[PDB]
Amino acid sequence: VQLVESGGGFVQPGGSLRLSCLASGFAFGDHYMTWVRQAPGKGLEWVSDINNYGDNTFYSQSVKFTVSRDNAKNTLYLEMKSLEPEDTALYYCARPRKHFPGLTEYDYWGQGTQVTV
């Protein structure tokens, strides 16, 4: 009934990373999924949403970044390219409860994966 991010670490300005989020416990197909950002001692910043099937993806002002979903492998991915130092924060996988893209009431999220460019 949970969500576990993975991937990320330290990379250099202009480097890359592909974060993953293995869902579990729920019908991964029936839900949109989200990426949010949290730098330390700041609020949540919304990064992206993706629809049930994967053909509609909504991003913020950071296209640098692509969201993907493999509803068979119950995995949500985020391929991050052309990283800047300002892209450093903790990166969260999160499921909205019940498309205007952006922050909303999330009923489940993960523990985070640290990205420090």
Partner: peptide, 16 residues
């Protein structure tokens, strides 16, 4: 946004 109150702290379900 949710039911856990925020207590001045921004985060999940607690948006400026």
């Amino acid at each position: 946004a949710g039911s856990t109150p925020c207590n001045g702290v921004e985060g999940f379900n607690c948006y400026f």
